[PDB]
Amino acid sequence: IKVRENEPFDVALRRFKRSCEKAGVLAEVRRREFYEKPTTERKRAKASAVK
């Protein structure tokens, strides 16, 4: 979660949060408890991941 750097620093370059929290994990927990849509969203996500 943290970053620090010594005096050679210019830019933020914190892409630790395109790794874990920001993009998916908080936008997922904005909306409803189903049990049902996730079983089919994961079903078609794993059925789309195919050659």
Binding site: I1, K2, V3, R4, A12, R14, F16, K17, E21, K22, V25, L26, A27, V29, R30, R31, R32, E33
Partner: protein
């Protein structure tokens, strides 16, 4: 006044508004500025521009403390936050840490229903 010389910039980016609170390392607030309190009410208070002018305006109003070092703590998602920390090192601050402190439940409370828009 009171001459703290190090603080924390808690930026609270949400989808509708970013609210920047500059405090000390004890956690006592020294002065805040919101994107909605800088003109541009409404669809324009959730933009990176509004967040950066919110952060410029929060860098003002803590001149009475002589803050040079600060950590940055970032909550929430938002069109803000990224631009926000930029405005902080456009205001002479030595930005030391950038932590992202978004609250994530370990499957806690049930989130609200919504949005069949």
């Amino acid at each position: 006044r009171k001459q703290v010389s190090d603080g924390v910039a808690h930026i609270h980016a949400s989808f509708n508004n970013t609210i920047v609170t500059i405090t000390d390392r004890q956690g006592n607030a020294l002065g805040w500025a919101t994107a909605g309190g800088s003109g541009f009410r409404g669809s324009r208070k959730s933009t990176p521009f509004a967040a950066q002018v919110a952060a410029e305006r929060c860098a003002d109003a803590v001149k009475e403390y002589g803050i040079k070092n600060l950590e940055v703590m970032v909550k929430g998602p938002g069109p803000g936050r990224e631009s926000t920390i930029r405005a902080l090192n456009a205001a002479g601050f030595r930005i030391t840490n950038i932590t992202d402190v978004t609250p994530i439940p370990h499957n806690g409370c049930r989130p609200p229903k919504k949005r069949r828009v």
